[PDB]
Amino acid sequence: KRAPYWTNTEKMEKRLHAVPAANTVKFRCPAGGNPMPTMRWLKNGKEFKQEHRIGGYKVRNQHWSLIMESVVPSDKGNYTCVVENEYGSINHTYHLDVVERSRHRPILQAGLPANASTVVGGDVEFVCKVYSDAQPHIQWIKHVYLKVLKAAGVNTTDKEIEVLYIRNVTFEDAGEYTCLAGNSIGISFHSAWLTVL
């Protein structure tokens, strides 16, 4: 009587599902047709088996849905629903991106910036590595009463790396230096001492 056809292209228009880790992901492909069409799911083009992920998955035929609970990064990929009956077969592919999130204040690498010593006129540097999901701001501070110093740095996929260079050190440069990081949750800071001889 009738080939399979999507009954709600609305939800299907949202091909990319980008979600935080620990979320439940539900893919739907509401289908019509007579007789009622059957449905199968593929992951990355091949048969999606229960053993393909920890905790497997669930399918609710009445809702034409694939359900994956507590998704993790290894769940990233393509998921294709194949619906069919005697009059035809159709498919739709969803893409899943899973991102691990953190609702914590910044975390700095222990030991950085490290203490340093140098003879007058010598050069020194201080390094700080900051991990923060929420975009952080970083300040290098000289305990002089605080003086904010301008440093250099680079952004990387999993952390901010900053370095403060102090050239032609003088006795006045001696003292404590702090790397202060903060995001929308809170702050964290590590301090180091510059010894001039």
Partner: protein, 149 residues
Amino acid sequence: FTQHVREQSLVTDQLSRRLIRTYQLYSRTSGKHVQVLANKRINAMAEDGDPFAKLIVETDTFGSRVRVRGAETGLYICMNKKGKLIAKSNGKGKDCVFTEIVLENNYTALQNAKYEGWYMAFTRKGRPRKGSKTRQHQREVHFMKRLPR
């Protein structure tokens, strides 16, 4: 350093290097990415990797206060008094600053700094939503930061 940060958090830090992150803003409702077009239009209908969806997010100061700029157009995403998202060449005003929030449901939200009750938001079809109608629990105000492709 609490008092120091409370103080510094009020305005732009003009004495420090300001960190920059580059990514795409995925809209939970639209399934697409935030983009700033040459005609200065802003929406969330861009496919993954669309040049106009590459955003440059520079921190303003502490508290995850940032400015969101379209790398391609060089235009900043700002909000006007009517809660309308507008693209501007000059992004100096507080109206161009947003506080990045990691919601309790683990999604990202961007709250405007000038109008503290308004959030960047888009509809299911990827159209801009007036900040005045935005509340933190609505899916329209939820995003996911995605790596550039």
